[PDB]
């Protein structure tokens, strides 16, 4: 037993990390096949950031205004197409190291691994979750712009996230790789509301299931409950309501623990009402909600 | 702002992960240049594990009793030397992918990244700390045997850890790459005492320094203290005593925060005495002690 936050191996993604410079500004891009993706705001001076017009800005740019470095390798840019908030750059060479990939738009509650770069170089990797309000709570400092998040699918890298901007709050926003923001955000330096966050209920249950499996079980109740019961609790404590589908996804855990979901939903109810009273679950002393049921299953079998 | 547990990029290490089979038992090895390292207990049946004689066991083995798979590549073994608890295997090919490396024995309190494998394949990466009692509190399931931990040094992979065994408790023990256990442990399936753990005080301070830097500062005291004062507190709450050297290492943080160490040692003293009263520091609601001062500095500058 023992259970920590764990990220996919990053090697496969390290191979695609390039630096992209365009005047002053210089950030990280993702170079796949013969295309290189990055946040479109590379084309700004920090003066433009205040209220850009990305077309009128972009219009005064030619391939040659774009430096793309891969370690010590240079790529001639030969084409440049803005796609929403992402910039695409056609280049002479196709990345040798391009792995099998897709682009995907993930959903609130879903986790991914993130590789944080600084000027086309990986410094570190961590796992995180898209919040219900389409933000994340990670660790990104200047130059980390254009860092990416992804899941790995045996062989296949599903890319879900490109990092753009921090919110006054210390939470992050960013796009899918088609360049559509996750959330109601825009690439402009103006007051922008995060919006009220909720707790990812399905995950929390997942986490408890993980607990039971590792030995930590003191919180196992004497009761049960129905759905409506518990949802109507959840509401109060800003938990996301639990559908049938959340139950079905948990079933695999029902199975391994031989614990019906609703008996766990009824352990949660109490913890929610009674607090945790100083004791620890899996070491943590609050309710971790950034492991999916899928996550727990990867790590409580052996993938 | 925002600050999470973050692991070095693993690519460089992924290239060295091989599977090693020897009869029944099959676990992960590390293949560097023309040598392959793994826990010596591969040579056991689970019957031997009860009380092995590793020489008399090893003596009945020939190179050919050893299957070494790298994805779908086979290595002829041509030499086999037990070195304490690790096994070394000479092989025809030198790993093409061998990066710059050293082997190092780290010290209580020091962190590293860990890449967890299953049958010569990386499933995941996480960061962790060697506890004062030479254990770790990670996430290792069967087949993860021979997984490794390491720091990366711009270009250079310092290997510090090879995983051997779990303790009834759900904490792990394992060797340096010379094959000497960290701690008073042996590769045998018998009752073995973890020993009393302490909290890594220097790190905790480091963590607070990280807090202040990210905005979280409610815990900033009205007082100060001397060393003896605080150490004599630490004792009670099972904290490691703080040397001058711990102060010197923290100084860089003193500098960036313009907060004298002892003013922080005096914020800690109170938190220790007063508890945390439900509020959160950097989200966590207890005292994280698994980031080094070095760690905080990597992430609170931009390496
Ligand atoms: C580059 N990585 C950076 C993101 C953050 C700076 C500090 N740490 C980071 O990760 N990108 C930007 O500079 C980013 C985007 C918009 C401004 N911006 C911000 O992060 C700002 N935030 C906003 O303007 C927001 F809309 F989110 F409120 C700020 C004020 C620096 C936090 C542009 C420059 C295009
Ligand atoms: C292989 N990875 C495994 C380690 C742990 C099994 C479950 N999760 C793990 O990470 N290696 C072993 O089987 C390991 C070493 C010794 C037994 N052993 C154990 O982990 C056992 N523990 C002990 O015997 C200990 F001394 F630590 F108390 C146990 C009972 C499975 C927890 C050998 C087989 C050589």
From Swiss-Prot, chains A, B:
Catalytic activity: TSAVLQ-|-SGFRK-NH2 and SGVTFQ-|-GKFKK the two peptides corresponding to the two self-cleavage sites of the SARS 3C-like proteinase are the two most reactive peptide substrates. The enzyme exhibits a strong preference for substrates containing Gln at P1 position and Leu at P2 position
Signal peptide: none
Regulation: Inhibited by pyridone-containing alpha-ketoamides compounds 13a and 13b. In turn, alpha-ketoamide 13b (tert-butyl (1-((S)-1-(((S)-4-(benzylamino)-3,4-dioxo-1-((S)-2-oxopyrrolidin-3-yl)butan-2-yl)amino)-3-cyclopropyl-1-oxopropan-2-yl)-2-oxo-1,2-dihydropyridin-3-yl)carbamate) inhibits SARS-CoV-2 replication in human lung cells. Inhibited ex vivo by michael acceptor inhibitor N3. Inhibited ex vivo by compound 11a and 11b.
Domain Peptidase C30, chain residue ranges per copy: 1-303
Subcellular location: Host cytoplasm; Host Golgi apparatus; Host nucleus
Cross-link (Glycyl lysine isopeptide (Lys-Gly) (interchain with G-Cter in ubiquitin)): 5, 90
Effect of residue 145 to A: Complete loss of 3C-like proteinase nsp5 cleavage
Effect of residue 142 to A: Does not affect ability to cleave and inactivate human TRMT1
Domain of life of the source: Viruses
Residue ranges that the UniProt entry lists as topological domain Cytoplasmic: 1-303
Catalytic residues (positions): 41, 145
Quaternary data: 3CL-PRO exists as monomer and homodimer. Only the homodimer shows catalytic activity. Interacts with host FBXO22; this interaction promotes the proteasomal degradation of nsp5.
Protein's job: Cleaves the C-terminus of replicase polyprotein at 11 sites. Recognizes substrates containing the core sequence [ILMVF]-Q-|-[SGACN]. Cleaves and inactivates human TRMT1, preventing tRNA guanine(26)-dimethylation of tRNAs. May cleave human NLRP1 in lung epithelial cells, thereby activating the NLRP1 inflammasome pathway. May cleave human GSDMD, triggering alternative GSDME-mediated epithelial cell death upon activation of the NLRP1 inflammasome, which may enhance the release interleukins 1B, 6, 16 and 18. Also able to bind an ADP-ribose-1''-phosphate (ADRP).
The protein's name in its UniProt record: 3C-like proteinase nsp5
Organism: Severe acute respiratory syndrome coronavirus 2 (2019-nCoV)
Residues of the full protein shown: 3264 to 3566 of 4405
